[PDB]
Amino acid sequence: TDGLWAALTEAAASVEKLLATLPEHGARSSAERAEIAAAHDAARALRVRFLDTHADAVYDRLTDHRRVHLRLAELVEAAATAFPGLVPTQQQLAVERSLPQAAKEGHEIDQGIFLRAVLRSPLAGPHLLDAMLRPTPRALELLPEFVRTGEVEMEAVHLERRDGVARLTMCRDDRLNAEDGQQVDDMETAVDLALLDPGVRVGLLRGGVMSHPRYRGKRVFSAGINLKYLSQGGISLVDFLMRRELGYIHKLVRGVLTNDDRPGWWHSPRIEKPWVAAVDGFAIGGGAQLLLVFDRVLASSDAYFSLPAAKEGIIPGAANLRLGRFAGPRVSRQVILEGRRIWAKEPEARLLVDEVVEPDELDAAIERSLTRLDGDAVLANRRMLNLADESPDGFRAYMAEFALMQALRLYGHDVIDKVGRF
Amino acid sequence: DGLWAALTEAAASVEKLLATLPEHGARSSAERAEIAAAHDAARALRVRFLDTHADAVYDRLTDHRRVHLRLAELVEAAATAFPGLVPTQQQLAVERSLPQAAKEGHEIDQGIFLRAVLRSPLAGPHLLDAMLRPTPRALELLPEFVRTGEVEMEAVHLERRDGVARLTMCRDDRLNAEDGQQVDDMETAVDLALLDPGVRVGLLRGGVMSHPRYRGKRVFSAGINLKYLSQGGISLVDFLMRRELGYIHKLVRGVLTNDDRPGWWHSPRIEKPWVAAVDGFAIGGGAQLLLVFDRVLASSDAYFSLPAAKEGIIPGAANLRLGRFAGPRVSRQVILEGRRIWAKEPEARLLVDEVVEPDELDAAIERSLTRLDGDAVLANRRMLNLADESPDGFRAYMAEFALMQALRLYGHDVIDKVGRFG
Amino acid sequence: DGLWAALTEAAASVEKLLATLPEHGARSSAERAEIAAAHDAARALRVRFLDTHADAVYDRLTDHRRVHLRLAELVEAAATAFPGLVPTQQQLAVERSLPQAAKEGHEIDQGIFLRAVLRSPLAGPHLLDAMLRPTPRALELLPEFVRTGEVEMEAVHLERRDGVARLTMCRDDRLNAEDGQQVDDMETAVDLALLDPGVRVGLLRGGVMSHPRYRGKRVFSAGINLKYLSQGGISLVDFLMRRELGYIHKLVRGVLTNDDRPGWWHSPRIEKPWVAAVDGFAIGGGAQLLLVFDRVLASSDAYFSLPAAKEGIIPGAANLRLGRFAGPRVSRQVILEGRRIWAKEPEARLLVDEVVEPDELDAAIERSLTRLDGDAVLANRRMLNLADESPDGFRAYMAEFALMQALRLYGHDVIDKVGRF
Amino acid sequence: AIGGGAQLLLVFDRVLASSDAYFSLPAAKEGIIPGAANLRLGRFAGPRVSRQVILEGRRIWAKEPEARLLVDEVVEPDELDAAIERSLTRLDGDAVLANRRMLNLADESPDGFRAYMAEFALMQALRLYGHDVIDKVGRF
Ligand SMILES: CC(C)(COP(=O)(O)OP(=O)(O)OC[C@H]1O[C@@H](n2cnc3c(N)ncnc32)[C@H](O)[C@@H]1OP(=O)(O)O)[C@@H](O)C(=O)NCCC(=O)NCCNC(=O)Cc1cc(O)cc(O)c1
């Protein structure tokens, strides 16, 4: 119509023709590498140009003019079948997923371009964000059993209702709560259950006792993303990096968007609750990022917080969005641009942590904190605070650039090389 | 679309239940649940109606945004032009004659209304401009104030001296506890200070108290009058919304005048710098006021708190402004957990520019007043306030605040706590 | 409609009064009040006209936002296409030959114009993109800079070394006091640093001074040239607005290039990280620069001030950015009351990452340059700057600033103070 | 205040400094003993800071927090004259005289001062003729 779809289709065909005829990734000459790299670039450039003008119409076809909420995975899958060449097919992703990161063609980058244009739209963006705030099907499935038993054991998370508290314990005892696609699914499911359970008033996130010999008997909050899986090709742009930000982490802030099925929905369409985080040992990378959204943060006297991948790492989620608010532009750049580690007992830890407690008094201090966040006053006040701290436009515009910026970093040679050495 | 008719019907059901059911407090649980469901259905339709019709409703009331109406006039004109949308003057009179525990909560409808009005990018800014205009009372008193340099009001004493508008809050029997009359006096005094060409700088300070526990001691503010709040005499519109959109916003942005002087084309509002001096303490609404001044001095023995963390209403615009001053951790410590901050602790410097011993405070106040005189200050504080708080940011917050605060004003926890004071 | 005719009417009255009345300073009180009233009526109509017509005015000048024009070209094309809206080149030359105290203040009309342009959600972002594009001067000098690794300019020395673009401000006789030429050199150097593929990180430092009170000592910046400001040589457009929308904004957002390289579809601007090293002091415009760098070092004896709290012009975008660094109390202490902040006091850490003894300063500057190399920094500092300062936030501020600063540039208190320096 | 001048500050009842001032006993590598600083500095700054200053030549700036170990008031150049004058009026009475006598007696015993100055007389004499000192001082 303006020719952009036809040009994209053409440029995608050239890519598929080079991938069919050229040797495997590791066997390509420099001229072959430069040729496919140029074809990828031409195709992706046209993905951007097409969506610059057609994003809203593309989204409208997929969601019936914003009348059906689709989560990220369903959205990019429906976009692949309805707009071939715009984003990779399930089959193309499975081929990618079976390769180590160093050998991938980087088809996820197209999903970054796509989600970029979707989140930039003032119509499509807020709708997709609402879609990710709704309860996961898995949580709705497990909710009756959780109301009954007060307990759910998941692969990466243990959830227990006790004294009105949703106790989320991250329990990957062999690898220091290193994050993966399954951890995100469990965290979101647990986060959904806590919010939907009327017997839960406050949530608590803590790391469990580790079993690895260097930490045996010691709790550890988070060692951040699983670098082994990232090297091996198992960290999904959509199902890990974007899902965690638009899903459970955003629900910690804004709650779960429910159906119009209860009183008061006209004033509170989302159910939100206050959250307490307790940091044992350390919070690193993705785990440090989580602390920027809790209502109360406690840490053991020996803990530290870092976003360590300053030279050859991916973007630390929404830390770049939120850290300036906590620490100011100098400290946030010291932390992110230069990898400054902040210790629980140094004065600037009070920018990130409310309470630092000696190991032998921490359990009791955690329990006291849980009783202080009970009321309706807290619910109203933290809603107004989060609204002031982080506007819908601010979050949307950031996650918009993040979708593409992070996709590129996930395929950067410096990242692949570093992660390979872990 | 049928929404007006559905609302009219649902409001009829409410009025019929109120006519037939027994008085508040004599109702059974089935009767209480029935009227609660009727209120909920009507209010849900108030929201839906205004979601699509707010701009047209506002246009009828203001002649397509060509007549500026203040809050009281707006909600009163909306009641007569759109029966059932917001309560009539007579329905409000009945409510106002009841203790808060017995009210049906018709003000909540005004919260719904003002929320939708402020959410409109067309209706919202016009209403905010209307509240920035000088009050009729101030225009009335302006000539005598220019002549005399003095006005004695019930809750405020205003004196022009050395180019300073000295506002002294002088409710000496109740620690300057706030009520509807205090707001009217404060706005009148702020209006006079800004309109008076003999005033260059404003000063807000608490007067000498006469209550036995504080006799001979100045006190800044003990916050909202909790007795009146329990008794039903705190108005959502004429107190909680009026102070935020009126005098407090005028401290930031000045008074919007007519096109009646040179330079109006670059400065349609008259703004001046303000100094606050805190004796004894600043609590609740009085603490909120400090987030808006150009200079804040405090006595060495003063403290600052927003104390109603468990069972209180939202602390005005503190939830909007405190994060900017103290960051997300300290602002939640203060608001979510009621942390009190003392003038001599290091973190008081987040809220206070100067902490001075009682016997050197008067002179330090006078010195501070001479430092804010020029045209440079005027331009710089205009640019600073513009950067600190965008029009959209303030509007969007006050929109949600209008409804969120209305709900809190009728919350059972609030009513119960407030009943127990004094 | 009718606003253009009324404006044309009011501008004619002004021109006819300026033709018949005596020179500025020879005017009586009645004559001064008459021309002041005429200026006021004309400027009021400039605002009212542009309130409704800004976008069409801009569309005529830029071919419906299809041609990028820089500030100087924009206001000059507006002068030729809409006579009386903004001053002509000839009217500006007359103004430029007068001391500030004698000017009619025709720049104020440009402030009105740029305010209305930047306020438009269509015209504003377009003008901002135009100022992010490389200056022609820089494109001209780029091939020799790639070859030689060195450019000597009047106010700036630029050297590529070890992948670092070393900008040394080298006005050794006046403590690097700023003027129109310094801005042109700074933007040219910043452009070169960003366009040069051999540069990975930029460094801004003050050079060794030659004035007797500072001989042999480096000094970062003494702020705007107050002598030139008194004499009428500080241009609203070519200095005060140019520096904010050009080289200072390029430090944040990079240079907008043509679609001429791989990856432009994700990175249409080339940005790089910047280090600032403050010797002696950073004052006024020089202190403003520090709110925009990725790393800031200072010598133990340095201080930072925005000193003109009583009788000064607005300190550029400090009013926009300082609150983010220091909070609303400190930022008002600095700007409203002229509080000076010393490198060794605790709150210096709000503005400065590292404070170092003079004898160890060169070495930590060098260490800092090696820490900002990767692709990780580039991605992270883009996301940080995006979170820190939204396009709307910057645009809306610079819109009001265009007029607010124009008025301050002609304020009697400013002219008087600056005359005494 | 450098060397002998910084030493003097350990003996005053009130010390004011301009915001741009610094205090050092700089000759840590090749200098003579800084008078009675080794006797008095520990009392003001503790054993860690006094060794940082004396053993390692740490320079202390008027605006850093630890300057308050040595200085009572740090004032901007344009307000310093007036701040000096105010300080002079606050030390007038007979009460100050009695109190500063009792303080100095508690702070520095006769035996302590004497025992230090006894060893100092010889230790400093040796340093005054040390080859490192002579060499370093020749290069100034
Ligand atoms: C914490 C440590 C210093 C501890 O070191 P030691 O005390 O020497 O213990 P180790 O033996 O390394 O750890 C014990 C155990 O855990 C394993 N371990 C520890 N951390 C990890 C991670 N992060 N991944 C995988 N495996 C891990 C380690 O391999 C050992 O297992 P075996 O090899 O089977 O023995 C170390 O584990 C470490 O440096 N880990 C890497 C930390 C790191 O760089 N994490 C990633 C940071 N970056 C992100 O999170 C990026 C991110 C995450 C997100 O969620 C979102 C987003 O947008 C971006």
Ligand SMILES: CC(C)(COP(=O)(O)OP(=O)(O)OC[C@H]1O[C@@H](n2cnc3c(N)ncnc32)[C@H](O)[C@@H]1OP(=O)(O)O)[C@@H](O)C(=O)NCCC(=O)NCCNC(=O)Cc1cc(O)cc(O)c1
């Ligand atoms: C400050 C105090 C601790 C002083 O304690 P004491 O030294 O024991 O003094 P008291 O004898 O109680 O005070 C003296 C005197 O003032 C009366 N007093 C003090 N504060 C009040 C208030 N707020 N209301 C009514 N009466 C009051 C107190 O009842 C005594 O009167 P008598 O009965 O005549 O003796 C105490 O008075 C107190 O707790 N006061 C109330 C504090 C409080 O929680 N105030 C409300 C805070 N919440 C808001 O402002 C909420 C708000 C305000 C807004 O403006 C806008 C908005 O959106 C939200």
Ligand SMILES: CC(C)(COP(=O)(O)OP(=O)(O)OC[C@H]1O[C@@H](n2cnc3c(N)ncnc32)[C@H](O)[C@@H]1OP(=O)(O)O)[C@@H](O)C(=O)NCCC(=O)NCCNC(=O)Cc1cc(O)cc(O)c1
């Ligand atoms: C820095 C100083 C304290 C140093 O004082 P001393 O140590 O006593 O040295 P001086 O002998 O005064 O300085 C040596 C030398 O530099 C010259 N010098 C120093 N500062 C200046 C300035 N600002 N202009 C011109 N010449 C200067 C001074 O005139 C001497 O020249 P000669 O007399 O010809 O020898 C002093 O020079 C001073 O007070 N300077 C003025 C500081 C000032 O107000 N600067 C401007 C502040 N305002 C802005 O930056 C405004 C601004 C700038 C922008 O870029 C953007 C914007 O929006 C707003």
